Design a protein around this nucleic acid. Structure first.
Lengths: 59, 59
DNA sequence: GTCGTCACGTGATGGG
DNA sequence: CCCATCACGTGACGAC
């Protein structure tokens, strides 16, 4: 079904977005970010892709 | 506004519900559970009450 | 002590 | 790229 981020994963994403101004990550970045997040859960590239797109759209 | 459980809190609640068969916890238990969960976030007894009420109903 | 309902956040898409 | 929805889980109530 649908992806649900660990809070730990959210900490990583939030750190990239706010502390590092990563808002529209490139393909290379999505794959590296995905590797990082997989330590804490199942996760695909598209999960990380949609997350930045949605969080950007909403901030 | 509304409470958002951290993953580690969700680990604790499911662990009490399924592994300890606590499904309509008593008041003393609600207070004890809240104390434990507060280690991981802001939390009030009424959150834990609603959580069991909601999880029991929808299971 | 149960049920129905709301309120809201958010993952997931599609269209242009 | 950005927009607008959709899908849906779920914290909160109210009522009884």
């Amino acid at each position: 079904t649908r992806w649900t981020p660990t809070t730990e994963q959210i900490k990583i994403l939030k750190e990239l977005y706010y502390n590092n101004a990563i808002r529209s990550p490139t393909a290379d970045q999505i794959q590296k970010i995905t590797a990082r997040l997989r330590q804490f859960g199942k996760i695909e590239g598209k999960n990380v892709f949609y997350w930045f797109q949605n969080h950007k759209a909403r901030e």
